[PDB]
Design an enzyme around this catalytic site. Structure first.
Site, short mmCIF file in Angstrom:
data_model
loop_
_atom_site.label_atom_id
_atom_site.label_comp_id
_atom_site.label_asym_id
_atom_site.label_seq_id
_atom_site.Cartn_x
_atom_site.Cartn_y
_atom_site.Cartn_z
N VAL A 26 0.34 -5.26 -16.82
CA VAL A 26 0.66 -6.26 -15.72
C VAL A 26 -0.21 -6.61 -14.67
CG1 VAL A 26 2.92 -5.19 -16.22
CG2 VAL A 26 1.81 -5.29 -13.89
N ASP A 143 -0.03 -3.89 5.96
CA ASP A 143 -0.51 -4.82 4.81
C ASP A 143 0.73 -5.74 4.35
OD1 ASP A 143 -2.87 -4.35 2.18
OD2 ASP A 143 -2.47 -5.85 3.77
C1 LIG Z 1 -2.12 -6.48 -2.88
S1 LIG Z 1 -2.62 -6.05 -4.31
O1 LIG Z 1 -2.49 -7.63 -5.22
C2 LIG Z 1 -1.42 -5.06 -5.35
C3 LIG Z 1 -0.29 -5.50 -5.73
C4 LIG Z 1 0.81 -4.83 -6.35
C5 LIG Z 1 0.67 -3.65 -6.77
C6 LIG Z 1 1.63 -2.71 -7.36
N1 LIG Z 1 1.66 -1.46 -7.56
C7 LIG Z 1 2.94 -1.28 -8.28
C8 LIG Z 1 3.19 0.06 -8.37
C9 LIG Z 1 3.60 0.38 -9.58
C10 LIG Z 1 4.26 1.75 -9.92
C11 LIG Z 1 4.13 2.74 -8.75
F1 LIG Z 1 4.75 3.92 -9.06
C12 LIG Z 1 3.54 2.51 -7.67
C13 LIG Z 1 3.28 1.03 -7.26
C14 LIG Z 1 3.36 -2.38 -8.69
C15 LIG Z 1 4.61 -2.74 -9.12
C16 LIG Z 1 5.77 -2.34 -8.98
C17 LIG Z 1 6.93 -2.38 -9.84
N2 LIG Z 1 6.93 -3.50 -10.50
C18 LIG Z 1 5.94 -4.25 -10.96
C19 LIG Z 1 4.73 -3.89 -10.22
N3 LIG Z 1 2.72 -3.39 -8.12
C20 LIG Z 1 -0.66 -2.78 -6.29
C21 LIG Z 1 -1.45 -3.63 -5.61
#
Ligand SMILES: C[S@](=O)c1ccc(-c2nc(-c3ccc(F)cc3)c(-c3ccncc3)[nH]2)cc1
Ligand SMILES: CCCCCCCCO[C@@H]1O[C@H](CO)[C@@H](O)[C@H](O)[C@H]1O
EC number: 2.7.11.24
Length: 331
Positions: A26, A143
């Site tokens: 994703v 952030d």
């Molecule tokens: C600011 S940077 O573009 C950024 C954006 C999102 C994430 C980001 N980190 C996660 C994420 C996934 C699993 C975890 F256990 C913890 C965080 C997700 C996530 C969680 C649930 N559903 C879809 C996506 N998105 C990391 C860095």
């Protein structure tokens, strides 16, 4: 111990237990969507990049695992699972984190859709609800921005991506330390503004431009505030900008619910001491449809004393491993 399987996805390898099926990249550590066979729910699995590449990476790895194990709130990302394929501390070099799959972020919403007032209400209410919880644990997010706010199809929202310049408190752009939690309230004001208008409040080109744009709206700081800036060069920049009248948020945000406008005025205040708190903002009349003081929980106290230590990569790695092994899944 679960049966693990191996897979390559966008050049990046994955070794996950069998309960997780249909792995689909994703974003890029790097995140995959997957099917949890145990619960029948879709999840996000995050593979940490190079967890123990350096002392900074190792401490950061520990920091994020510790943080996420503590966060137990409807509007904050929480941990469904954490695993490593490694048998023993000796092998340990990969950490996977698992949470409920969300689907979109608030930047995919802006964007895209034109947001009516009830939707802005519900969205901002959920941010402030998660934020009250986070702040009650003595954590500053640092952030907060549309891409750090995950939203599903129901418009249910969760805060993730704990600490652009567009959403950043002016005191952060000025350095300063002894940031208070209301640096996050500033970001909420910027996010709220954008959802109301469909436009970035303060789209600065650099740190200096960012400050000018902020000042154009909220006006020059008064003498009481100017006296707190030790930095003579910041003071010189500020005082050179002729003199900004504080614009009428009422004009800037014409067309908006006047209760949205009043709350915004309380969020986007230069003096961080005089910014509304998350808890205060939830009792603002703007959220009357949503506010329930018996359903806005606070967090257990959170031990971040570790933030003081200078430890060796191996020490951070051993502590992280202990946190993986002691993890207890939610109901
Ligand atoms: C600011 S940077 O573009 C950024 C954006 C999102 C994430 C980001 N980190 C996660 C994420 C996934 C699993 C975890 F256990 C913890 C965080 C997700 C996530 C969680 C649930 N559903 C879809 C996506 N998105 C990391 C860095
Ligand atoms: C655009 C330039 C305006 C500068 C904004 C300064 C106002 C920030 O507010 C300041 O933040 C500090 C907390 O970190 C506190 O020590 C001060 O009491 C508080 O007034």
């Amino acid at each position: 111990r679960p049966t693990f399987y191996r897979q390559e996805l966008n050049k990046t390898i994955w070794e996950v237990p069998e309960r997780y099926q249909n792995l689909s990249p994703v974003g890029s550590g790097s995140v995959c969507a997957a099917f949890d066979t145990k619960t029948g729910l879709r999840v996000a699995v995050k593979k940490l990049s190079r967890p123990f590449q350096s002392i900074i990476h190792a401490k950061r790895t520990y920091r994020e695992l510790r943080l996420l194990k503590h966060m137990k709130h409807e509007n904050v990302i929480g941990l469904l699972d954490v695993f490593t394929p490694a048998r023993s501390l000796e092998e340990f070099n990969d950490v996977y984190l698992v949470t409920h799959l969300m689907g979109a972020d608030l930047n995919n919403i802006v964007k895209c859709q034109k947001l009516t007032d009830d939707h802005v209400q519900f969205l901002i209410y959920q941010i402030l609800r998660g934020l009250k919880y986070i702040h009650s644990a003595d954590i500053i997010h640092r952030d907060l921005k549309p891409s750090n706010l995950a939203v599903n199809e129901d418009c249910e929202l969760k805060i993730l991506g704990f600490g652009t310049r567009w959403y950043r408190a002016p005191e952060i752009m000025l350095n300063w330390m002894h940031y208070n939690q209301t640096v996050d309230i500033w970001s909420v004001g910027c996010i709220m503004a954008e959802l109301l208008t469909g436009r970035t409040l303060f789209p600065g080109t650099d740190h200096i431009d960012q400050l000018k744009l902020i000042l154009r709206l909220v006006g020059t700081p008064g003498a009481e505030l100017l006296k707190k800036i030790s930095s003579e060069s910041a003071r010189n920049y500020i005082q050179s900008l002729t003199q900004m009248p504080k614009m009428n948020f009422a004009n800037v945000f014409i067309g908006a619910n006047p209760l949205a406008v009043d709350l915004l005025e309380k969020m986007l205040v230069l003096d961080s001491d005089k910014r509304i708190t998350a808890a205060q903002a939830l009792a603002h009349a703007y959220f009357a449809q949503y506010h329930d003081p018996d359903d806005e929980p606070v967090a257990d106290p959170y031990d971040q004393s570790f933030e003081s230590r200078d430890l060796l990569i191996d020490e951070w790695k051993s502590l992280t491993y202990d946190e993986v092994i002691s993890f207890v899944p939610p109901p």
